[PDB]
């Protein structure tokens, strides 16, 4: 699901240098076990910026014809420091051209932010509150459009839309609507922050978010978490967890999993599979650091093939191996992480079924998944839910929730089956 294009970029070193920072090398790896040299920052008014072709996150293949393959960080630095003022770079761009193709909530084509804000104010001030209008609008606009609605609402009423909705709404409907009004990174960061209660930490919610978010999402959550709460997320994980569960949660929350390379490393797939077996089912006890490193460092496609090759060696697959090897929060985090790796849409489909199958509703889990995945992979979640449970996700939301709260959730579902 990416696009790679190689390009030669020729720059002139001006009075303030080439104008970008490089990360990487065999001893300062950009992501896990990746020795490539990458562009981290690009300085305004610099040579690279004024040129425009080089982008943040580019991989630098060579400098003046000299390859930056398997170099120490200093040797890569030295090639730049000792190049002339005319520097020729071969660069590899990595692209993401997907967006919300599998989300259920699409951008409204006839969007009018000022009009939406007016209609929402009117629905708010109406005697008794017009919840239906509020739900109809916000659950049928994309997250970014909701931001523009919120901005215009403040501009018109000189009051924040979220504050007005805290007073006009209640119950589970308020929880959904307030969740939709946050950006994805803000929603996840606030859900993570709300889970940390010292010894009473909501580990299930930590596991859900940290095990299912990608590198890009996690790096944005990390950035937004520090802005909102003036403390790094990793520090909050450290002071709210312990033991191997903390190490796993810290490692995943760094968001530095290896990106899927073009070549498939079949030798490393087999070796990782053997290591997971040797560290667990094959021995007395468990080498947990070995599981943590492998399951957090390797790319998701690579690990998908590792777990299948694992069944060639182990009488038990990875999931039932975990249930036989570890307990408690550690076992639950491993089970969630492996499901996310093997089939993330199915992972959320099973969680949604879990939140509704029994008595009552785990509304916190149901709402968080319906909100956070509505613009990511909700169509895939619905497909996996339908295939496994025979009836639709729409149907289960219908039987388990009522009123305008049900209406908003069904809108985020997007349709039947």
């Amino acid at each position: 699901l990416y696009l790679v294009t190689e390009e030669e970029i020729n720059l002139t070193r001006g009075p303030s240098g080439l104008g970008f920072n490089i990360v990487g090398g065999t001893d300062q790896q950009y992501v896990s076990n990746d020795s490539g040299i990458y562009v981290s920052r690009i300085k305004e008014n610099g040579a690279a910026a004024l040129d425009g072709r080089l982008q943040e996150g580019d991989k630098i293949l060579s400098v003046n014809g000299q390859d930056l393959k398997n170099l120490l960080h200093q040797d890569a630095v030295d090639l730049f420091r000792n190049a002339g003022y005319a520097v020729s770079l071969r660069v590899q761009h990595r692209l993401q051209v997907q967006g919300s193709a599998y989300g259920s909530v699409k951008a409204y084509t006839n969007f009018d932010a000022e009009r939406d804000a007016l209609n929402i104010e009117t629905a708010i001030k109406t005697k008794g509150v017009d919840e239906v209008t509020i739900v109809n609008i916000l659950t049928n606009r994309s997250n970014e459009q909701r931001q523009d609605i919120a901005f215009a609402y403040q501009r018109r009423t000189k009051k924040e839309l979220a504050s007005a909705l805290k007073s006009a709404l209640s119950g589970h409907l308020e929880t959904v609507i307030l969740g939709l009004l946050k950006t994805p990174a803000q929603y996840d960061a606030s859900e993570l922050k709300a889970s940390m209660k010292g010894l009473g930490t909501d580990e299930d919610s930590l596991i859900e978010i940290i095990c299912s978010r990608t590198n890009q999402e996690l790096q944005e959550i990390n950035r937004v978490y520090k802005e909102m709460y003036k403390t790094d997320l990793e520090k909050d994980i450290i002071s709210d967890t312990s033991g191997d569960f903390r190490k796993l949660m810290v490692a995943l929350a760094k968001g530095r999993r290896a990106e899927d390379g073009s070549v498939i490393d079949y030798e490393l797939i087999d070796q990782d599979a053997r290591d997971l077996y040797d560290a667990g089912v094959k021995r007395k006890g468990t080498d947990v650091p070995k599981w943590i490193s492998i399951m957090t460092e390797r790319s998701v496609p690579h690990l998908q093939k590792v777990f299948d090759r694992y069944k060639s060696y182990s009488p038990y697959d990875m999931l039932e191996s975990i249930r036989k090897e570890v307990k408690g929060d550690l076992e639950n985090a491993f089970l969630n992480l492996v499901q996310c790796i093997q089939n993330k849409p199915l992972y959320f489909a099973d969680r949604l079924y879990d939140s509704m199958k029994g008595k009552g509703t785990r509304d916190k889990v149901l709402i968080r998944i319906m909100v956070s995945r509505s613009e990511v992979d909700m169509l895939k979640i619905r497909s996996e839910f339908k295939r496994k449970y025979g009836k639709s996700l729409y149907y289960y939301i219908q039987q388990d929730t009522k009123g305008d709260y049900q209406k908003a959730l069904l809108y985020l579902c997007g349709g039947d089956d």
Binding site: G17, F20, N21, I22, G24, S40, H73, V77
Partner: peptide, 6 residues
């Protein structure tokens, strides 16, 4: 964190 300015 941080890389190297070039």
């Amino acid at each position: 964190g941080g890389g190297t300015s070039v």
